[PDB]
Amino acid sequence: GAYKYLEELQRKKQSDVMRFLYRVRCWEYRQKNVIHRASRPSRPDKARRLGYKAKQGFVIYRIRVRR
Amino acid sequence: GRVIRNQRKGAGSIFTSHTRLRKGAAKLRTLDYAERHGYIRGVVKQIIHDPGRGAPLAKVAFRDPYKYKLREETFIANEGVYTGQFIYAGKKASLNVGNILPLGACPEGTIVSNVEEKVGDRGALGRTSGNYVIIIGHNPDENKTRVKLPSGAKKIISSDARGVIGVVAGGGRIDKPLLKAGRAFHKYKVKRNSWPKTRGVAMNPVDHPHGGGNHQHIGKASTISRGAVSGQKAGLIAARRTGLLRGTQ
Amino acid sequence: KALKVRTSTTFRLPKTLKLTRSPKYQRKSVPHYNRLDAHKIIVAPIATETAMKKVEDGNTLVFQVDIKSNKHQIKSAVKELYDVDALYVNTLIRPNGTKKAYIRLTSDYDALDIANRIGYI
Amino acid sequence: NPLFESTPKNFGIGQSIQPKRNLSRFVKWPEYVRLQRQKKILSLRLKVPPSIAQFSQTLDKNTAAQAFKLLNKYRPETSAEKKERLTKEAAAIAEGKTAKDVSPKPVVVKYGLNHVVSLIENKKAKLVLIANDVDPIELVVFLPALCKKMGVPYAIVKGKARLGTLVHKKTSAVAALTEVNSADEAELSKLISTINANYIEKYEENRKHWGGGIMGSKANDKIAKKAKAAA
RNA sequence: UUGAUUUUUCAGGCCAACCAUCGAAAGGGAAUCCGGUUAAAAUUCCGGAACUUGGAUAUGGAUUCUUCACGGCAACGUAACU
RNA sequence: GUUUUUUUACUUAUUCAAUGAAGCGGAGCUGGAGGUCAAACUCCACGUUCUAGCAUUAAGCC
């Protein structure tokens, strides 16, 4: 399906496409609260691999942490 | 050793400013449309004393341009401003004592006070009694004005920054001696807890770098590096020179 | 395309409908009975010599009352228990922690007769 | 008549109070509004790589209308339609018959990203429509390249919500046709010819075209005056 | 906030700069006095005489056909007096 | 053709400041100039300054 393509694409973090996406999304995430609810996973294939299912009762939160 | 008095001041416990009797902060108006493009007229309602301040303040009333309502402003009074006087603030305001003008609109040699460092900060420079700022020159291509500050420094400011024409009132306070510990006591009673001052050489070594010894003396050079750390900066901090000043500067 | 006109620069929370609760089960199955009825408000007469002097003279009945009751409840309680009307109720929390009420009856009543009927004189 | 005078108000500086103008340009919007507007701006300001910049050119109104005209004749079963087909099949099997007989082979649109990707990889898709507004974009960013390698005609259409209502869902990332009826082969062929000119035949030259780099209105004003000064 | 409508629903309109809350039995603050009375309470009880606040509401008055009162040069006066 | 140094351009990252996010940017009317010589090419303004009053809930026109 598409999840295999997403898996292989997310491994190219230094390609121009992924660098652009990371820049835009990092700015967006940095604009919102330190902890905020995410309406959906930004990486559905990664979330699936870790146990997520698109069912009621599964919840995604986003958080930034100081490096 | 022990935390010295220098260091204790920053925690702000007994060293905060005594502000109960103060009469509001002295600021220019916010830069609004009227001051950017034309002028707005206000009237001096009161000239009042501000405890802790040497300069009197002026309470000036303005109409609100956008709603039916009266706006009061607290200005630093220049000498000659009187109650009932009309005050003009804006780009097109005339060159009269008490008027608020952009620095670019004032000719060379103009004396001005409560001058803005940056455009719209509502006044930073030349605010104490008897002081003022001199306009030295204009650089219209860069939209910059060159001024002379009370300390003697020369500075470049945007020509859109404002100032109030004239000299800050109350000048000449320091020409009369205080004469008494009690006068100094009443002076700082409405300023902050900075008085009296115990000399460092009169303390013990725990209290100060100057403390101790079988005579009172500093014992090492009183000139301290700018790169020294808190607890060491007592004396003459990063002095370029010392001793009686002789000749020109 | 068709854009709102806004005469203020302040954006405010819009007005949305607030529904009243319609629970699918009531939270408390049995409502509590009256927690201060008249019999719990009036504990007992006080019949010390000082109290009965106030009965004989000032048309005043003296009672121990529940510590939680106020003057309105005490007035209503004596009305419901003894069918008398209080001109006023003066209250007092005693040094032992109980409440005492000085109730003066209106001129339509004789406190001594009411005290004889209640049974402590 | 003499009692109805004209009393013009004077709205200059220092004069009468300003009238209630339209200040929508100066409104302090809530934070989520500002965030979603600046997200769009920031995607416009930066240089967009060609893989993402592909999705900026979508089917025009006319060709998209024609595509959704054909594609609406092949909508999937609604819940009620499936219910009736199922009761009819139950009748057939409570008789001697079976379900295959009474119901014809379906010819419907194909949706679902994994399903459509696997249909393309098997060269079973005749036409794929890709929504231009998928977020996260990596869900379909590879799809034009996949369709190119498989030789499957594709078009970047506008509306995951439109594709959704086509197949009775809220949104749909993609929609595909594996087959159509004999009466529609002509219009599908014409549709494919029209969209192949902008998408699958241009794919290799779009691989070299960056997007974005667009400044704001005030910045474009400064550039224009510089361009007239030397003029 | 009204216009009311009962229908406990509406119809509008006016604004939202500021305002969680705690912080004084000597600061700020609605209104009570005198005489008498107990073994022990009283500006708290008894007798008499008031006052303040909140509410309801009737009579009398005042006002209006020059509609929202008159007088005094004026300072200002008055039982009222949108 | 990819690379280091210097310099300087940009604005969206980031940083500082103001506001009850009220008039920003560009264009255009209206005038006044610059003697024009092609017709508007450049410039500048565009409702408030004897006075300790008043300005709020739009008149008017189609």
Ligand SMILES: CN[C@@H]1[C@@H](O)[C@@H](O[C@@H]2[C@@H](O)[C@H](O[C@H]3O[C@H]([C@@H](C)O)[C@@H](O)[C@H](O)[C@H]3N)[C@@H](N)C[C@H]2N)OC[C@]1(C)O
């Ligand atoms: C030294 N004088 C400067 C003058 O050079 C100029 O500064 C610009 C500044 O306006 C530009 O930047 C500005 O303008 C851009 C856009 C509208 O052009 C905006 O996107 C940006 O937010 C804004 N800060 C900045 N990118 C370069 C400076 N030299 O304008 C401001 C000024 C103070 O007069």
Ligand SMILES: O[C@H](c1cc(C(F)(F)F)nc2c(C(F)(F)F)cccc12)[C@@H]1CCCCN1
């Ligand atoms: O630059 C000078 C100047 C001085 C002073 C003064 F020192 F008095 F404050 N004020 C000036 C002012 C003034 F501030 F507005 F008064 C304007 C322009 C020049 C001034 C000279 C003075 C004579 C006229 C020409 N300007």
